[PDB]
Design a protein around this motif. Structure first.
Motif, PDB file in Angstrom:
ATOM      1  N   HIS A 213      -3.733  74.277  19.763  1.00  0.00           N
ATOM      2  CA  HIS A 213      -2.912  74.784  20.855  1.00  0.00           C
ATOM      3  C   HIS A 213      -2.124  73.661  21.517  1.00  0.00           C
ATOM      4  CE1 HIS A 213      -5.873  78.044  20.367  1.00  0.00           C
ATOM      5  NE2 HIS A 213      -4.933  78.839  20.846  1.00  0.00           N
TER       6      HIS A 213
ATOM      7  N   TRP B 205     -11.814  86.540  32.529  1.00  0.00           N
ATOM      8  CA  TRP B 205     -11.161  85.241  32.524  1.00  0.00           C
ATOM      9  C   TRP B 205     -12.175  84.154  32.841  1.00  0.00           C
ATOM     10  CZ3 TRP B 205      -6.111  85.437  31.212  1.00  0.00           C
ATOM     11  CH2 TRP B 205      -5.356  86.558  31.567  1.00  0.00           C
ATOM     12  N   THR B 208     -10.091  77.318  33.290  1.00  0.00           N
ATOM     13  CA  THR B 208      -9.830  76.111  32.496  1.00  0.00           C
ATOM     14  C   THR B 208      -9.296  74.984  33.371  1.00  0.00           C
ATOM     15  OG1 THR B 208      -8.585  75.134  30.622  1.00  0.00           O
ATOM     16  CG2 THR B 208      -7.502  76.878  31.847  1.00  0.00           C
ATOM     17  N   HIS B 216      -6.328  77.665  36.819  1.00  0.00           N
ATOM     18  CA  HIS B 216      -5.824  77.986  35.487  1.00  0.00           C
ATOM     19  C   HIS B 216      -6.846  78.872  34.790  1.00  0.00           C
ATOM     20  CE1 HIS B 216      -3.795  74.379  36.517  1.00  0.00           C
ATOM     21  NE2 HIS B 216      -3.295  74.107  35.326  1.00  0.00           N
ATOM     22  N   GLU B 218      -8.055  81.285  31.301  1.00  0.00           N
ATOM     23  CA  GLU B 218      -7.901  81.636  29.901  1.00  0.00           C
ATOM     24  C   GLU B 218      -8.758  82.858  29.617  1.00  0.00           C
ATOM     25  OE1 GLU B 218      -9.718  78.830  27.029  1.00  0.00           O
ATOM     26  OE2 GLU B 218     -10.663  77.814  28.725  1.00  0.00           O
ATOM     27  N   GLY B 251      -7.987  86.951  23.913  1.00  0.00           N
ATOM     28  CA  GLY B 251      -8.320  85.603  23.495  1.00  0.00           C
ATOM     29  C   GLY B 251      -8.262  85.401  21.993  1.00  0.00           C
TER      30      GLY B 251
END
Ligand SMILES: [Mn+2]
Ligand SMILES: [Mn+2]
Lengths: 271, 274
Positions: A213, B205, B208, B216, B218, B251
């Protein structure tokens, strides 16, 4: 080897209300750009108003960008998207922009391999209808190689297949997008050179094809080698613009100031 | 009356790779004990007859059809064609015996400024005011979804409530995870919007997609992140919610493993509540 600023690079500050379009144009002039590359998502502003802004700040538009669904399966939507593409070309004439760049599909609308397979002939059919209109108006029409791999316009092979089937169509090479597609960015330029009339420059630091990524990076702080591209472009006497693209989270004005210092240093080393 | 559905969107990675077709997703949903699928419709290429055949083969139903439609289009001809497209999606719901449609009424890349956001909102409302009577005439429940890209004027509790209170008959698919992105407390969103919520998307979620509150985020396997599903389930059970709870995963874990892992958590939490 003139630089242009994508208005899309300043989208964070336009969305927050801190900058309007005139502020972006003024900022591009103050930062020494020769042009802007104008993202056009509606026709809310009159051409008169935009032309006024450009005259005030002694700026030009290098290219008008738009997202249009040329993969639409539903006949009436497909036809209206061709019509919209023609309206964008009309705006390029009004605003004295020599070029249009279309992103001809939306990634959320390709939800299977079969969707991708079907989307490709549809996009090609649309571009065979739109490009003659651009030619008749004196506008160079391009597509951009993209970053979402379910779109059939990301790899060198994919973009080449479209270009070779649409007379007169040209390419805006997004150098950083090629990395996401698993290609060597310089190899993309070498293989597609005859079609490349515009370029977007953006950088990445370490979802890809090669399974790793990437994050948007300030230009020069990531993995993309801009000097090697500039070297080949000068060698080949490329005559288009180099457009500054930034999709990261650093303040957009700071990102432009910092990234442009690297890009101009690299270009100056090649000249 | 708490039932689970599988979003076909959750399997999009394996559909894009060619490893699964729609029938495989339907069969997988049946084998994993789902009551329905929530079908993402991005074209009308599939035959209605063949989808119905698949549902009968696997003893499955469609709880809701999802679609992305640009109801913010400023150009009149495009706007009107997107209203017609939305009506055709409602017709597909009839043909497929889906009781509900969920529209995401705009695209994030097409709102490039605060002014664009301001102008999009009355446009979206006016479109929904035309589409909702058509859905009503076909016995289809029409919903919007609260979204995760904050330039869209349908992410916060206040934004979605402003639309719902202006469109008679419109209902809400609450994406519980998306409320976190918008800076809201997911449970408070459910409590404030309860009378409109007829469908729900469950996703998780981990810290991160850029949040209002800074963090943040992910995508996470359900139960491995920060979303409290048990608190939501307890409130929906208390209020006798009759809709579906749709499994959403965005994801990188193999999509079949993600369903198996995430559903184990979700079923355990619901079980602790009932
Ligand atoms: Mn680009
Ligand atoms: Mn959702």
């Amino acid at each position: 080897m003139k630089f242009s600023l994508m208005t899309y690079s300043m989208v964070s500050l336009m969305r927050s209300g801190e900058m309007n379009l005139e502020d972006v144009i003024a900022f591009a002039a103050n930062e020494g750009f020769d042009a802007i590359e104008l993202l056009m998502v509606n026709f809310s502003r009159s051409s008169d108003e935009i032309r006024r802004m450009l005259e005030t700040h002694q700026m030009k538009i290098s290219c008008i960008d738009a997202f249009v669904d040329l993969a639409a399966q539903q006949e009436e939507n497909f036809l209206e998207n061709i019509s919209l593409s023609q309206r964008i070309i009309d705006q390029a004439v009004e605003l004295s922009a020599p070029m249009v760049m279309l992103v001809p599909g939306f990634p959320d609308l390709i939800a299977s391999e079969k969707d991708k397979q079907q989307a490709l002939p549809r996009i090609i059919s649309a571009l065979q209808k739109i490009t003659p209109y651009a030619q008749s108006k004196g506008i160079v029409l391009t597509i951009e190689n993209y970053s979402a791999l379910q779109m059939p316009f990301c790899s060198i092979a994919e973009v080449l297949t479209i270009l070779e089937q649409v007379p007169g169509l040209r390419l805006t090479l997004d150098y950083g997008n090629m990395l996401v597609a698993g290609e060597d960015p310089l190899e993309a330029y070498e293989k597609l050179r005859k079609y490349i009339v515009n370029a977007h420059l953006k950088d990445w630091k370490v979802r890809c094809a090669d399974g790793r990524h990437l994050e948007p990076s300030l230009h020069g702080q990531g993995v993309i080698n801009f000097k090697s591209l500039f070297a080949e472009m000068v060698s080949n006497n490329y005559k288009g613009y180099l457009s500054f693209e930034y999709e990261g989270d650093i303040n957009a004005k700071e990102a432009v100031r910092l990234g442009m210092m690297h890009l101009r240093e690299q270009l100056n080393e090649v000249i």
